[PDB]
Amino acid sequence: PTILEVSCTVADCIYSADFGGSLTLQYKADREGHCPVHSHSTTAVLKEATTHVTAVGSITLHFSTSSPQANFIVSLCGKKTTCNAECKPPADHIIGEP
Amino acid sequence: NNSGRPLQETAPFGCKIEVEPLRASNCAYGHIPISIDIPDAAFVRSSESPTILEVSCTVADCIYSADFGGSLTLQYKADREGHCPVHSHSTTAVLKEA
């Protein structure tokens, strides 16, 4: 399924080792399938890899970033959209994760 | 004979003076800073609680008072049925429902 029109709306985000960022992709596609989602930046990584895509709807995804600002392109079945955000400093000081 | 009035009828801020031990109960004054470490079990990731695509607010007739005399309506669009919390981030407004 090659999606037709997708847009990105980013919720509260934070730059830390843990997955302290969330966003939503509002998509309009043509078939029910298993589209692969990805991040096209070196300073952001998603949690989910393959997401069930419907005809029209939304998908919520998580991400971790190292930049103070989320200024990164997310790709869904090839279609690219630039997510613009503003991530605050982390609340914690130390983590048990890399 | 010249004892005057007791402190029960003169203590400001409406603090009820009680004895054994001497103390003032329900003395409403100032603010207290409270730091709460909420357990990690209560929190849930954003992918479970239904994010809402958009919300529009329409305020009905209101009177600024102590009682919950003001009303409003929120037109919401979401992707799933859930139990969302509602808050007012202004200092001069509070909500009956949370």
Does the residue A89 lie in any domain?
A: no
| Of residues A11, A3, A15, the one with CA closest to residue A41 | A15
Contacts of A77 (CB under 8 A, 6+ apart): A1, A2, A3, A29, A35, A36, A53
| Of residues B72, B76, B71, the one with CA closest to residue B55 | B76
Number of domains in chain A: 1
Domain containing A52 equals 1-84
B80 contacts in chain A (CB < 8 Å): none
> Do residues B53 and B45 lie in contact, with contact meaning Cβ atoms separated by under 8 Å?
no
CA B91, CA A63: separation in Å to the nearest integer? 32
Query: Which chain A residue has the Cα nearest residue B49?
Result: A60
B45 contacts in chain A (CB < 8 Å): 22, 62
For chain B, give the number of residues: 98
Does the residue A94 lie in any domain?
A: no
The DSSP-derived string for B13-53 is: GGPEEETTTTEEES---S---------TTT---TTTS--EE
Torsion angles phi and psi, residue B8, rounded to 5: -60, -35
What was the elucidation method? Answer: cryo-EM
Does the residue A13 lie in any domain?
A: yes
Does the residue A4 lie in any domain?
A: yes
Give the pairing of strands A37-39 and A71-76.
antiparallel
